[PDB]
Design a protein around this ligand. Sequence first.
Ligand SMILES: [Mg+2]
Ligand SMILES: [Mg+2]
Ligand SMILES: [Mg+2]
Ligand SMILES: [Mg+2]
Ligand SMILES: [Mg+2]
Ligand SMILES: [Mg+2]
Ligand SMILES: [Mg+2]
Ligand SMILES: [Mg+2]
Ligand SMILES: [Mg+2]
Ligand SMILES: [Mg+2]
Ligand SMILES: [Mg+2]
Ligand SMILES: [Mg+2]
Ligand SMILES: [Mg+2]
Ligand SMILES: [Mg+2]
Ligand SMILES: [Mg+2]
Ligand SMILES: [Mg+2]
Ligand SMILES: [Mg+2]
Ligand SMILES: [Mg+2]
Ligand SMILES: [Mg+2]
Ligand SMILES: [Mg+2]
Ligand SMILES: [Mg+2]
Ligand SMILES: [Mg+2]
Ligand SMILES: [Mg+2]
Ligand SMILES: [Mg+2]
Ligand SMILES: [Mg+2]
Ligand SMILES: [Mg+2]
Ligand SMILES: [Mg+2]
Lengths: 85, 135, 141, 155
Amino acid sequence: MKRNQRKVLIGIVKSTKNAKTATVQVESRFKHPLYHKSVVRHKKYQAHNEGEVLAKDGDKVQIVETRPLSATKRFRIAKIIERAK
Amino acid sequence: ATIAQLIRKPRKKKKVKSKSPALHYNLNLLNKKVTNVYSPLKRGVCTRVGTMTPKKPNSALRKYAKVRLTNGFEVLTYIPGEGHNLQEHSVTLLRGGRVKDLPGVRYHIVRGTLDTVGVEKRRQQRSAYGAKKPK
Amino acid sequence: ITTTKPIKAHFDPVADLLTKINNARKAKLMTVTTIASKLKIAILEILVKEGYLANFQVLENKSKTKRIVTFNLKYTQRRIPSINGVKQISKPGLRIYRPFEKLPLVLNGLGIAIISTSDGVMTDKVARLKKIGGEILAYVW
Amino acid sequence: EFEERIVKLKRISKTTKGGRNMRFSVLVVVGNRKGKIGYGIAKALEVPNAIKKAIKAAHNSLHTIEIHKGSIYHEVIGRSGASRVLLKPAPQGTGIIAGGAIRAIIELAGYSDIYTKNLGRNTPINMIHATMDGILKQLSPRRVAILRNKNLNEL
RNA sequence: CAAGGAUAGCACCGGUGAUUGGAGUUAAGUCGUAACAAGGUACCCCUACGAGAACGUGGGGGUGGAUCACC
RNA sequence: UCCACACCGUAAACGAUAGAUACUAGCUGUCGGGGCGAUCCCCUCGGUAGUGAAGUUAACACAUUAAGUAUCUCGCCUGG
RNA sequence: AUUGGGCGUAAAGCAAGCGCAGGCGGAUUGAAAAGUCUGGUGUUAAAGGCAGCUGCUUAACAGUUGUAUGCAUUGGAAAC
RNA sequence: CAGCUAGUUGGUGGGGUAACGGCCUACCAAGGCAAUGACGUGUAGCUAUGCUGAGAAGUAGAAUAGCCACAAUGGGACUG
Ligand SMILES: [Mg+2]
Ligand SMILES: [Mg+2]
Ligand SMILES: [Mg+2]
Ligand SMILES: [Mg+2]
Ligand SMILES: [Mg+2]
Ligand SMILES: [Mg+2]
Ligand SMILES: [Mg+2]
Ligand SMILES: [Mg+2]
Ligand SMILES: [Mg+2]
Ligand SMILES: [Mg+2]
Ligand SMILES: [Mg+2]
Ligand SMILES: [Mg+2]
Ligand SMILES: [Mg+2]
Ligand SMILES: [Mg+2]
Ligand SMILES: [Mg+2]
Ligand SMILES: [Mg+2]
Ligand SMILES: [Mg+2]
Ligand SMILES: [Mg+2]
Ligand SMILES: [Mg+2]
Ligand SMILES: [Mg+2]
Ligand SMILES: [Mg+2]
Ligand SMILES: [Mg+2]
Ligand SMILES: [Mg+2]
Ligand SMILES: [Mg+2]
Ligand SMILES: [Mg+2]
Ligand SMILES: [Mg+2]
Ligand SMILES: [Mg+2]
């Protein structure tokens, strides 16, 4: 079949101190509107560790969007590369 | 300076101030608020007429008037003419301007549009002073 | 070839070479040396091809751990150089990227513009012929 | 037919033991409208003698100008003190987009279509110096070919 | 469930206010002469005290100081 | 004014010149290490001074200890 | 003053230092391809702008055809 | 304008909604955002575009067109 593909974001977990969650952080290099130089930004997205993925602190994690599981939670974890910490 | 420095603190442009601030204040008179709406020329009412002395070089007696506009600002306005009918209590119509001799004066009175009479005995540049065509 | 003085170079490879070349031109000096990097080697190769230098020559230490490039400027008989000025565009911090549509023309074609698109450094005219652009290193005229 | 035109007529003066000595200074631009142009500044007690001396100096100091298709070949910036004048080639038809001292210099030199802008001070003598520096620093497209061993401006 | 009403104490902003402080602008006011020359006690900076007022003096710091002078 | 212990945190706190890096004539002193070996003097590597061309500057002047050719980062300026 | 300015004497180098975060950063090899370049596709409403033409006595004006910019996806390039 | 937030953050069962959802409910936990600027204050309908500029862009969001919100002020609901 043909299925529309979701958007993906790769990030590093910053903290995890709740039930079934992992507040991940994603960086980007958007250009400046005027001086035209890359600027590093930081935004802390949230996901849920439903199971089989664990993804404890310091784990480089891939993230795929989803239908909103709750307020401020719209992302879920996926394949994990460079398992550490 | 430096690209990083300007990225952190961008260039702030110097502000611009008007030359006739009192003509751009509107009082609602129901809610009693003053909003900044630009207006070319505004109606006021005079309170005190008289003469002032020009600053350093000039020497004369120039006709001024302390006029309070339709808003709540009282301004010193120069009457541009030879002879006037101002009687310390009248309605005038101020426009922008700036006489160099008198410090503090930054408005002029349009002649011959409202209660203030026009300037007769003038055939040159009369359209500025409000004088009927001799015909 | 044997040397006696220590050889140092700036951290910025394009502007190091540009400063060396400009100072040599202004002081009428002919031969200069610097630390060798592959960007600098390619850029000197294209300068020699375009005819702004006489020769460039790379050398390696006896232990094959250090490499230095020495080049000479092309002066005429009356001793006035072929280089008239150098200006660097893609400085560190602010890197300049221009597509093909905005590839610059230096001094109405008299000078050359060094562009390192995808196949190493490349002159403005050959970049226009190949219809592809990229990083713009320096203006030399 | 070396046409001449007056650019500036200043009234300079010095002070002596009582009174002031006043002399007129003229800045004249002399050009044949074919490639030869010079400038001359002179001071004298009277305008006619000042003009005569200025014309003499301008004719004494003449420079050779090369034109390409009636315009300037490549964009240049002439610097002289605090005055910087930007010259830019123009297509045939725009005419002289210069004003003042630059316009006088360009017309008397013979250029037809030039884009110009005075980016610095507005003192006629320094503007003229910057304009002359910009036009003199120009490179023909045969000297560069000789220097780089190219083929007479071929690709 | 709930607009609204009553009561109550905090939060921010605005107008006005006897009286009072300084400021600017002012052709021909009064008191001195602090600064510009070695400005007649070289000046200036920080600071403390004192005096109608410019300012005076102590402490430290500078030449952005005059003369001086060497064959 | 001096001493001990606590504050104040300003100066014409000046080279009126932020720090780092590479390159660009020369001449005259002086201070330290090193090479030779009476001093003196010669060479090399550095510190601190004077004179001085290219180069820069509105001019004075700076001029290998830059105010020159360029890069990086920080601080600061936008009429009285 | 990104394109496109300056800080010795004109406004502007903090009194000096130790410095986290940020910005920048020696040489060579390999991988991936986040920046960078390029091909295909979808879209960026119409009107407006520019070029051509028609109709109002020509114009103003009306109509008509062409005309970019950015985003996303997919396929390559590997110099920085 | 340096802290703001207690349905605020997260988990379990159920209810409600065209639909997912602290949208709501009962239980269990203390988290969530914030110097890369939360929160507070002031101001403003946003956009295609108008005017200006060589360009980068500055400025107003006339007419008209897309979207949002309102119908004296503040709430609730029927029909569909
Ligand atoms: Mg979950
Ligand atoms: Mg749940
Ligand atoms: Mg006498
Ligand atoms: Mg005195
Ligand atoms: Mg004295
Ligand atoms: Mg007394
Ligand atoms: Mg005393
Ligand atoms: Mg004292
Ligand atoms: Mg005493
Ligand atoms: Mg201070
Ligand atoms: Mg000291
Ligand atoms: Mg000197
Ligand atoms: Mg002011
Ligand atoms: Mg300036
Ligand atoms: Mg100063
Ligand atoms: Mg200092
Ligand atoms: Mg200072
Ligand atoms: Mg350090
Ligand atoms: Mg660090
Ligand atoms: Mg490198
Ligand atoms: Mg459209
Ligand atoms: Mg039309
Ligand atoms: Mg402009
Ligand atoms: Mg509208
Ligand atoms: Mg309207
Ligand atoms: Mg009504
Ligand atoms: Mg129904």
